[PDB]
Amino acid sequence: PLSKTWELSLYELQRTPQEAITDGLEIVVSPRSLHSELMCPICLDMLKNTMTTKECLHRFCADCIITALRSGNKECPTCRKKLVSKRSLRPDPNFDALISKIYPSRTTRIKITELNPHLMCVLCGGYFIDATTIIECLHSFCKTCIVRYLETSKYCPICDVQVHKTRPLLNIRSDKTLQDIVYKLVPGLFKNEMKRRRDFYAAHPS
Ligand SMILES: [Zn+2]
Ligand SMILES: [Zn+2]
Ligand SMILES: [Zn+2]
Ligand SMILES: [Zn+2]
Numbered sequence: 001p002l003s004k005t006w007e008l009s010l011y012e013l014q015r016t017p018q019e020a021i022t023d024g025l026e027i028v029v030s031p032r033s034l035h036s037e038l039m040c041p042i043c044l045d046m047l048k049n050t051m052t053t054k055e056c057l058h059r060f061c062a063d064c065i066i067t068a069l070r071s072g073n074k075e076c077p078t079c080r081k082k083l084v085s086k087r088s089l090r091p092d093p094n095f096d097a098l099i100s101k102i103y104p105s106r107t108t109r110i111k112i113t114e115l116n117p118h119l120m121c122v123l124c125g126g127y128f129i130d131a132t133t134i135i136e137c138l139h140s141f142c143k144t145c146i147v148r149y150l151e152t153s154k155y156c157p158i159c160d161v162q163v164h165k166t167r168p169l170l171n172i173r174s175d176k177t178l179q180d181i182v183y184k185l186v187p188g189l190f191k192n193e194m195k196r197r198r199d200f201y202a203a204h205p206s
Contacts, residue, residue, distance in 0.1 A: 006169050011200045012144045017126025018189055020116050026109040027185060029102055037181040038099055040064050041078055046099055050092035054135040056081050057175050059095055090138045094118050098181070112186070119182050121145050123157055127189055131179040134172050137161050146172060 040047050042064035049062035058078040060068075066086050068077055076083045083089075098118045102110055121128050123145035130143035139158045141149070149157055150168040164171045183190040 002167065002169050006143075006147050006172075008144055008147060010204060011197055014200070015129070015144055015196070017121075017124040017142075018129055018193060019126050020120060021112050021186065022116075025112045025187070027112055027115075027187065029108055029110055031106065031108065035102075035181060035184055037177050037184070038095065038102070042068060046103055047095055050095040050099075051086075051089040052092040052095075052138055053081075053083060054088050054090060055083075055173070057133055057135070057173055057177060059092060059177060060089075062091075065089060090136070092138055094138075094140070094178075115185060119186060123149060127186055128179060128182045129193055131175040131182060132172050133175040133178065134163055136163065136171060140175055140178055143174070 034046055037059075038046055040059070040061045042060055045061075047059055047061055050059050051062045051065055052059050053076050056076055056079050058076055060077070065077070069083065069086060074083055074085070075081065098115065101114050101118075119127055121140075121142045123141050126142075128140065128142055131140050132143045132146050133140040134146070134156055137156055137159050139156050141157065146157070147169070150163065150172075154164060154166075154168045155162055
């Protein structure tokens with residue numbers, strides 16, 4: 001049920017932000033390879049005018065997925081969930097902005113401060129951890145941050161559009177693709193977060 005899906009763990013109830021790297025670090029971008037999270041799975045090029053399925057948060061070039069639906073096959077090409085029409089998609093300017101910085105229409109080093117705005121939760125001011133996306137407007141937050149926020153508001157923290165008339169948790173989804181590209185881009189973030197969890201569970205055994 002919904003109550004179990006978004007119940008926060010003992011760790012999650014006390015978690016604190018993963019603070020941004022602001023020291024001048026540059027990350028390495030390889031020539032002639034893509035991060036697969038930034039690749040359209042239909043045309044196999046970097047995403048162009050990214051559109052994202054509301055139900056399953058899968059990304060495609062706008063033209064690729066609109067054309068795919070005109071085959072008559074009304075499903076998501078990535079997971080095969082039903083996809084009624086292009087109104088089941090939303091524009092993803094965050095992915096577009098990330099791509100424009102990592103793959104400038106082609107440098108080998110990128111300042112992580114240039115990427116940070118696209119990888120950070122505005123509620124805690126740190127990097128996304130268990131990124132979770134409001135499906136109507138495609139704004140994203142840490143799981144714990146948005147779950148706690150929606151206990152006292154039914155409106156998006158960023159754009160203020162009502163998430164749901166009565167139960168906002170119905171209209172959020174875990175965003176694996178966003179969290180995966182965050183962990184791939186931010187050095188040490190996955191390692192640091194898993195260490196925090198291990199340290200917590202060791203201090204609170206059961
Ligand atoms: Zn494409
Ligand atoms: Zn899908
Ligand atoms: Zn957060
Ligand atoms: Zn929003």
